[PDB]
Design an enzyme around this catalytic site. Structure first.
Site, short mmCIF file in Angstrom:
data_model
loop_
_atom_site.label_atom_id
_atom_site.label_comp_id
_atom_site.label_asym_id
_atom_site.label_seq_id
_atom_site.Cartn_x
_atom_site.Cartn_y
_atom_site.Cartn_z
N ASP A 39 30.88 -67.34 -5.69
CA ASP A 39 31.83 -68.37 -6.11
C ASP A 39 31.26 -69.79 -5.97
O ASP A 39 30.10 -70.04 -6.30
CB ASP A 39 33.07 -68.19 -5.20
CG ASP A 39 34.36 -68.55 -5.89
OD1 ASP A 39 35.16 -67.63 -6.18
OD2 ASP A 39 34.60 -69.75 -6.11
N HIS A 69 37.57 -73.38 -3.68
CA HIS A 69 37.90 -72.08 -4.27
C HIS A 69 37.18 -70.93 -3.57
O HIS A 69 37.81 -69.95 -3.17
CB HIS A 69 37.56 -72.12 -5.76
CG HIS A 69 37.96 -70.89 -6.52
ND1 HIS A 69 37.10 -69.83 -6.74
CD2 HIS A 69 39.12 -70.57 -7.14
CE1 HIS A 69 37.71 -68.92 -7.47
NE2 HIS A 69 38.93 -69.34 -7.73
N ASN A 161 43.24 -65.32 -16.01
CA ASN A 161 44.57 -65.92 -16.00
C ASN A 161 45.07 -66.43 -17.35
O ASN A 161 45.63 -67.50 -17.42
CB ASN A 161 44.59 -67.09 -15.01
CG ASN A 161 44.11 -66.71 -13.63
OD1 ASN A 161 44.38 -65.61 -13.15
ND2 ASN A 161 43.41 -67.62 -12.97
N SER A 224 42.24 -64.71 -9.26
CA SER A 224 41.15 -65.09 -8.37
C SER A 224 41.53 -64.81 -6.92
O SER A 224 40.67 -64.57 -6.08
CB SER A 224 40.85 -66.59 -8.52
OG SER A 224 39.80 -66.81 -9.44
O1 LIG Z 1 39.04 -67.18 -12.84
C1 LIG Z 1 38.10 -67.93 -12.64
C2 LIG Z 1 37.13 -67.73 -13.63
C3 LIG Z 1 35.93 -68.49 -13.56
C4 LIG Z 1 34.75 -68.56 -14.37
C5 LIG Z 1 33.95 -69.51 -13.85
N1 LIG Z 1 34.55 -70.08 -12.75
C6 LIG Z 1 35.79 -69.49 -12.56
C7 LIG Z 1 36.77 -69.70 -11.56
C8 LIG Z 1 37.94 -68.92 -11.64
O2 LIG Z 1 38.80 -69.11 -10.77
#
Ligand SMILES: Oc1cc2cc[nH]c2cc1O
Ligand SMILES: [Ca+2]
Ligand SMILES: [Ca+2]
Length: 279
Positions: A39, A69, A161, A224
């Protein structure tokens, strides 16, 4: 073991009915397993990780999570208070920048990296990879996800989403990995959750409280957030010896709460992640 007044999502995963607030789980809590969070990075210094988290690779100038995130997702996987597998080891791979974006080539590189890197780690109970990311369909991205899964890592990816069929979204449309949709606390499919026949399971994804950068906490929503609930559950079940990386997704689906969700389109599974804990 039981966590009283737990975040709704954790209580839901160890419950057969919505509306409970205690998270019941086995004390082994995923120790011995490892989860790679691919991430924006992880704030490893956060107290909630108790030193069980560490950055292992960046694709940018720094390995720090300047977004939040990634730290949030990692917390749902294994932070003390907000995590599913409270004793798991967390490894961060930063493939997304601090705005939360990244190019497909570096996301693919991050996946290949994990398939190789797990060979230099001590993860006796198993390895899991959590990917709360995705974009428009790409056969190269799907291919990288399939390679990671075949290398012996349990891959969990967000369905997306867009309130659309996940077949047009890459990470999500790769059949061999575990595609996760989101649900809210009233057992309804989250209004933003993608759906479709490629989905394997649903997990709590609406207003999920977890860790955030700056040593804080924050509640956010998305497939996510659902993804790490099942990545964490896989790690938990693997150290319990119930399943392996190659069959964890199928095992989770086999043992899920079935038919409990509402707002599920015909053709989409009505399965909600469940740990099957009996004290
Ligand atoms: O759902 C998600 C999809 C992508 C694709 C790239 N960053 C992201 C971050 C998110 O939260
Ligand atoms: Ca029921
Ligand atoms: Ca699948």
């Amino acid at each position: 073991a039981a966590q009283t007044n737990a975040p709704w999502g954790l209580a839901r995963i160890s419950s057969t009915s919505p509306g409970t607030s205690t998270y019941y789980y086995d004390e082994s809590a995923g120790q011995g397993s490892c989860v790679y969070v691919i991430d924006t990075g992880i704030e490893a210094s956060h107290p909630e990780f108790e030193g069980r988290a560490q950055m292992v690779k960046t694709y940018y100038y720094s390995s720090r999570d300047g977004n939040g995130h990634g730290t949030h997702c990692a917390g749902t996987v294994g932070s003390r208070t907000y995590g599913v597998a409270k004793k798991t080891q967390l490894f961060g791979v930063k493939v997304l920048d601090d705005n939360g974006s990244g190019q497909y080539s570096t996301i693919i590189a991050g996946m290949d990296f994990v398939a190789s890197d797990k060979n230099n780690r001590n993860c006796p109970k198993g390895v899991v990879a959590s990917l709360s990311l995705g974009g428009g369909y790409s056969s190269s991205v799907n291919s990288a996800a399939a390679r990671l899964q075949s290398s012996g890592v349990m891959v969990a990816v967000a369905a997306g989403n867009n309130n659309a069929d996940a077949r047009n979204y890459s990470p999500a449309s790769e059949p061999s990995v575990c595609t996760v949709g989101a649900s809210d606390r009233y057992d309804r499919r989250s209004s933003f959750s993608n759906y479709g026949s490629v989905l394997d399971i649903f997990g709590p994804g609406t207003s999920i409280l977890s860790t955030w950068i700056g040593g804080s906490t924050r509640s956010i929503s998305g497939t996510s957030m659902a993804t790490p609930h099942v990545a964490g559950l896989a790690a938990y079940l693997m150290t319990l010896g119930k399943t392996t990386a190659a069959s964890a997704c199928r095992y989770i689906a086999d043992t899920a709460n079935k038919g409990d969700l509402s707002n599920i389109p015909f053709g989409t599974v009505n399965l909600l992640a469940y740990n099957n804990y009996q004290a």
